[PDB]
Design a protein around this ligand. Structure first.
Ligand SMILES: *[C@@H]1O[C@H](CO)[C@@H](O)[C@H](O)[C@H]1NC(C)=O
Lengths: 48, 49, 48
């Protein structure tokens, strides 16, 4: 966390910095997309 | 926009497909995005006039 | 794959696979599987 790292979250490959998100995900949501289909946020498949 | 490609995200194309036929989809996406950027710059030049 | 019973191409059998860890090397490593054609995905990447 808080360090530029290559991440593969459940098959989603990418490069970026991971930070504790402060946006209220509803319990049935599993991804967050910004404009133009870019994955803004993702939930850890292990600790959720 | 998928520009006719399987997916609009490059990472999925590279992960799902091996280089041989993956390059075909990457070429399509790159051509589409180059065309869009060229159109953007052409419009910018026209408006700059 | 190894079931003795295979249905006709009509009323074709359908099995849903859920909540498991797959390993596709057990499939394409088999000698009889002469034909292995994939659309939208490649044989080498299935395990990733
Ligand atoms: C996954 O396993 C870890 C380690 O045992 C555990 O801390 C975590 O709660 C588990 N999560 C789920 C969704 O089972």
């Amino acid at each position: 966390k808080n360090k530029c790292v290559n991440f593969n979250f459940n098959g989603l490959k990418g490069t970026g910095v991971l930070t504790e998100s402060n946006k209220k995900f509803l319990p049935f949501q599993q991804f967050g997309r910004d404009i133009a289909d870019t994955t803004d946020a993702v939930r850890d498949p292990q600790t959720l | 926009s998928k520009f006719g490609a399987i997916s609009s995200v490059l990472n999925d194309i590279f992960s799902r497909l091996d280089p041989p036929e993956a390059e075909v989809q990457i070429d399509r996406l790159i051509t589409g995005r180059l065309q869009s950027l060229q159109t953007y710059v052409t419009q910018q030049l026209i408006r700059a006039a | 794959f190894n079931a003795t019973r295979f249905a006709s191409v009509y009323a074709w059998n359908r099995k849903r696979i859920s909540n498991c860890v797959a390993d596709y090397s057990v499939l394409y490593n088999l000698a009889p599987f002469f034909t292995f054609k994939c659309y939208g995905v490649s044989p080498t990447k299935l395990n990733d």
